[PDB]
Amino acid sequence: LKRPKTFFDISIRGDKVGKIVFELFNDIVPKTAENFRALCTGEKGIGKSGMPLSYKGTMFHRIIPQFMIQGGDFTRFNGTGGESIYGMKFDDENFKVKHDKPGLLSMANAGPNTNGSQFFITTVETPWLDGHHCVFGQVIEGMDIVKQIESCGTESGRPRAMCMVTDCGEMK
């Protein structure tokens, strides 16, 4: 099977800056790749939170230069929420893929088997994250836009400008 491809449309400080396109490692982590894929299309509908299972209109709420950019919180928009297509949380699937390069897409979590909808995109190699966060895809287009989002962050993770996924979906 092909690796699924998805996209974020991105605006920064209210300005359209282009598209990020991901490819998802459904050959390595099919449950984790599927969660992100279906959250890009919104096809599952309304979650246990009462809000759409969709990344549309979410923010990169935690941005740390020379580390990663993190988003996916579509229930509280601030990093305190989110929900997967499997429930509030789902298990770590495997750790086959290493955080050994920029542009990797990986699951944010609060410890083992606590994946939800939050994800991060690395901007450096992050080997200390290996074995703790499931890497499930990578940026194939728009790494510069990832850098433009990164440039709005701080050491504490607080954004200095609103970077938004204005639309998203699957490329098929």
Binding site: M68, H132, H133
Partner: peptide
């Protein structure tokens, strides 16, 4: 919540 910096 998310990845920690080490």
């Amino acid at each position: 919540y998310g990845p920690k910096w080490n």
